Design a protein around this nucleic acid. Sequence first.
RNA 1: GACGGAGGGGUACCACCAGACGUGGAGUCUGCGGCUCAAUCUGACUCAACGCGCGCACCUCACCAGGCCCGGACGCGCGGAGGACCGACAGCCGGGCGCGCUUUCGCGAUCGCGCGGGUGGUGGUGCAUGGCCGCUCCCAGCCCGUGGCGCGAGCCGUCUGCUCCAUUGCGACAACGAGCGAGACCCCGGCCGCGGGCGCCGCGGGACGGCCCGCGGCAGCGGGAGGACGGCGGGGCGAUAGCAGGUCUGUGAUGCCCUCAGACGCCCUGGGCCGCACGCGCGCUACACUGGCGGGGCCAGCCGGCGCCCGCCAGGACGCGCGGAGCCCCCGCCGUGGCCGGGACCGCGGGCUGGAACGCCCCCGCGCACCAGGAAUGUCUUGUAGGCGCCCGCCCCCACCGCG
Lengths: 204, 49, 102, 101, 66, 64
Amino acid sequence: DEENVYYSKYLNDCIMEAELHEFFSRELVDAGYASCSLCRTIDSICVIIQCAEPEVVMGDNHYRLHKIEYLLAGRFMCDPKNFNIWVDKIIKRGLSAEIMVDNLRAKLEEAMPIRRAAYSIIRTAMRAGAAGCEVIVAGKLRAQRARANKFKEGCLISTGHPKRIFLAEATRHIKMRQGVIGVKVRIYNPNIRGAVMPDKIEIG
Amino acid sequence: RETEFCTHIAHKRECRICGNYNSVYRKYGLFICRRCFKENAGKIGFVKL
Amino acid sequence: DMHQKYTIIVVGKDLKLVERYVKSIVKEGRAFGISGPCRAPVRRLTITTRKSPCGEGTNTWHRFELRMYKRTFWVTCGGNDISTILSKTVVIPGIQVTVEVE
Amino acid sequence: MVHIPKAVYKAVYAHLYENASLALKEYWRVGNVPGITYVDENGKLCNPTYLHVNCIMQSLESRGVVKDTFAWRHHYYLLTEKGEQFIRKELDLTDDVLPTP
Amino acid sequence: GKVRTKTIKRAARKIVENNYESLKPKDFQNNKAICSKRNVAIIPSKRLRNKVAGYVTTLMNRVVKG
Amino acid sequence: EPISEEVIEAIKDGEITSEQDSKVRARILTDKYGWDSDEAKQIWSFGPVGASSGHMTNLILEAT
RNA sequence: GACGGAGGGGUACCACCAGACGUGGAGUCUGCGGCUCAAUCUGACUCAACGCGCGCACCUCACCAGGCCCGGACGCGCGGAGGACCGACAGCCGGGCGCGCUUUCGCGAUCGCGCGGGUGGUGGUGCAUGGCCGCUCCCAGCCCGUGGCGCGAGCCGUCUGCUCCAUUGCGACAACGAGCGAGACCCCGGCCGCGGGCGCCGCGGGACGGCCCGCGGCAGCGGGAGGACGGCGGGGCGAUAGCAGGUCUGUGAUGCCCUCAGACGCCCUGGGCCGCACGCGCGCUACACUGGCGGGGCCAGCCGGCGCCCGCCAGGACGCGCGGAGCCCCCGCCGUGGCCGGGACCGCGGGCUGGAACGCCCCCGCGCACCAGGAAUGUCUUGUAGGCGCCCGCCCCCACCGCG
């Protein structure tokens, strides 16, 4: 028959992964939240969360990862010990846009001149080896009228499939006092271990 | 009060991410909003050509 | 002998994460006689949504597809040998390998 | 007036204390919360009102005893030390008894 | 018809500057085989590699007369 | 609306003055002068050039 | 730089040419204005509003006519435990509800009251905003390093020539090299191979203006084959800037007014959103003999269940694990007649789905306009237009719609 209900549970698991990425973003954003992946073994769920600061995520005595394990399992109808979470560290932090955008969001709420902070984020990705970084801050920046302040440094690419692979992007709705501003950090890493630019011809 | 509180029984299908009744995408399991869905489709993995 | 044909159904959205897992299933079960992969005809989950949050402007639609990949193997081997195979095969997070007993 | 059976109040404290957390889908129509069971005075099996747990929950976050995070139409309440003392006092457990985590 | 772009064009000259004898005047497969020798000339994608070879074949054809 | 003399005597005394927190004078007007409590809180200003007799008050506030 | 109601060049079936198939003319379907209302909730008004904000009996639902309910958290001053707070049989009243009323029972600090201080609101303002789309853009611009020329702002590069689908390249030339956008890439398709095969489904080749003949310094410009495939195959992605485009009514996006309890919260019932002197937009069905009407073959693809019995049907009961269009063709028939063209309206019924039709289906009547559409206006280049069905989206029911 074509019933094949195996696809339906696969879909249900991915929907939980989307919820997981949304819950972690609200709580573990201070704790360097970048991304989550769900793993199902023999009826076992273990989530890999990529974070800049695993120690805050873990907590002292790992009571914070335990309390949130108990919560996520309790929410997803699992029992603790039938599931667990695993937190990994982020290396070359600048190339991670989600980490950079929350760094920008912090310095903007710390009342730093915007262009000063934007070049600071750009330099943290420039140090990391990104070919370019593009910061767009849009909102009521000190004025009732809204203007979008685009700051950019080095080459960035915007078209084709190598945008999905080489260019990372990160939007944060930082709620400033006057209304709400939006910070978008984009990093372009020309070189990664796997695929290479489909145009760049090396020529010896 | 409970005699009439929600005495009408009808589907209250609502987007899982938003909570909005209008335009719930019940194509399969997903009950996601149409304005809520194209936002998180990369996390669900749906992608375009 | 408690010998049964054991079903192995793999679902991976990512063709390369799923295709490498097909190599993994073949190698671990080479000893226990794993089956050649019967790849399910791809099932595409298709949703078309208007690109506009507010329905105004030229009609622009988003064509979104989840091209789930399912590959099925059957092994007539020991339950401890089926279990060794599950431990032996590469663990890719977000990949569904499911076993039924025939 | 949502007069609350003390069994429902007592049950949530324990369910939450064991897990040090709670997940509540936001539901305000008549319903019974899954995962909480209060034994009725006649030995019956009962599930607490989605409204009643929500009302007790509104008091706890407002007190400042418990933290909450919200995503996808589900509340994500967690225990905090400030209310660990209160929940133990309600549950009669002490500093030696810890949330099972 | 099909107009060669600057990548498909500058690289073709760089190939005829470095290599002369290996490519031949009307030999697309040979011009595709020389341009495909891994590190000596690296062009990701056959479509780009084939297009390069066709321009090399045209450049090689031009040089042989004069 | 004519102001009651007792409110005016307090205006001259300084119990109710333009130069005061908005709420403090509101409590005085409602708790001694039988004023509408919402109206006492919504008083926009005193008149004329100085803050003598003469008051301006806001709307019902359901329609504010 | 921004504009010009200035001169040139260039370009595109959202331009034209040459053609196509249309619409505007009729009936209806749906949206828009107006009109009418208790309410007809609203945005949107040139392209870039108007089958648009993916199906309005209920819900949705924001609007109207009524009626519950605190589900007002925390904090303080007071109140209350022999008694805070709400429940209730029966009768009346009321569509109905212990809503109130008569009554006299319950009930157990989950709390009352005063003040503060909340939480919620499809309320407003998109001309306070984030985000996301539309549009300029079914285009081809946008920059930099070093040098040259200017006292500089700066220009050159990035060019009044040619080529292109293209700022795509050539050629000339104080420029010389790079980048982003274009392309490449990604997806699907045709063909060959490899490995597998509950099921055709994984990886590799192949095509490059390569070759040939012209005409060209040239980029290329026609032709010829060979080859599944030929000269941008059918899509995705999309620069620099933008614009008071659209959205606060998608969101636990949001600033401000925050309504906040005889509520703009939140529920329940009833009604509307579908009301119609009218004018318009997207459609559908027509005006027939290249057709209608009967039987006979046969046939798909996105991707796909059926059996049996009762029923003209529509459907129903009871089961199991499974299956497929029309156009067209073949034979009769009608025979130019508003006719068997056309199915609009309306009188019975029989069913379906639901709590409830007003929704739909079916059946027997009933057979309106319309005999090819005025000024105008649209879209289109090979598996194309058109013609023909089918699937899904949203959905209790239901597609003249959209996406395929």
